[PDB]
């Protein structure tokens, strides 16, 4: 009768190189990741995360062993990545997720000139009637870092929400400074 819910976010970021590379023809860098929604240490209950890529790469089955779990790579086309999260308790069935690697922007986002492409989704790992060890591990999770933890996608919207503060403060500061300096020098 014990149900534990762990919120997580899994996704990918991508940066366009501006031109097709001559070495391998790739056009984008991308990082595929799972990270926690809360500021908590996934390593207390995750043994490893395996990411299975498209068969174009020299090895498609990548592995990561510490949170925030992520892999950085390069590519030119979109493909589905299978993320298999294994838990410390071998009696617990690992979780399977399918992430559509997004590298290209939509027309609306392309017109806005945004420097990064992001696709990420929120999910909740549900452990129903978990073992005593697994329950203790899930309940004893510690905080990951003392800093803030945040989410990115819709990237254009988050960037606009950031700039709505940033440019306002910058313009205020700029104009106020210019006025102060000019008045003081005129006297």
């Amino acid at each position: 009768g014990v149900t534990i819910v762990k919120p997580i976010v899994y996704g990918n970021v991508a940066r366009y190189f501006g031109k097709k590379r001559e070495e391998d023809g790739h056009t984008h860098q991308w990082t595929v990741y799972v990270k926690p929604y809360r500021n908590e240490d996934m390593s207390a209950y995750v043994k490893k995360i395996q990411f299975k890529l498209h068969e174009s790469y020299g090895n498609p089955l990548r592995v990561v062993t510490k949170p925030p779990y992520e892999i950085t790579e390069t590519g030119w086309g979109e493909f589905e990545i299978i993320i298999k999260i294994f838990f410390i308790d071998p009696n617990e069935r690992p979780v399977t997720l399918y992430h559509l690697l997004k590298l290209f922007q939509s027309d609306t986002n392309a017109m806005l000139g945004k420097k990064t492409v992001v696709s990420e989704f929120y999910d909740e790992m549900i452990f129903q009637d978990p073992t005593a060890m697994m329950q203790q591990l899930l309940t004893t999770s510690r905080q990951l870092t003392l800093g803030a933890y945040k989410h990115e996608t819709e990237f254009a919207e988050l960037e606009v929400k950031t700039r709505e503060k940033l440019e306002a403060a910058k313009k205020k500061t700029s104009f106020e400074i210019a006025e102060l300096k000019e008045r003081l020098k005129a006297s």
């Binding site: 990561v64 510490k66 949170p67 925030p68």
Partner: protein, 81 residues
């Protein structure tokens, strides 16, 4: 932090082997050296943090590292004042 063991690159390991006298190096020697260096740092820093926590200090001083290396048998001069 994470995956900072990869901050020990193939040129660095090859220079460390050149300084040890090795002429030709294999491919998996780099992974073996990273794994061995990580295991060594694990014990050294565990001893250092054990000497630190016991002192109720928030900073790992150089004397803590010196004492850890002495415990592990690697007496290190040049950092004992």
């Amino acid at each position: 932090l994470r995956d900072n063991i990869q901050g020990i690159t193939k040129p660095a390991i090859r220079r460390l082997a050149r300084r040890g006298g090795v002429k030709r190096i294999s491919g998996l020697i780099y992974e073996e050296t990273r794994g061995v260096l990580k295991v060594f740092l694990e014990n050294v820093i565990r001893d250092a943090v054990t000497y630190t926590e016991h002192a109720k200090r928030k900073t790992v001083t150089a004397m803590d590292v010196v004492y850890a290396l002495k415990r592990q048998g690697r007496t290190l001069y040049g950092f004992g004042g």
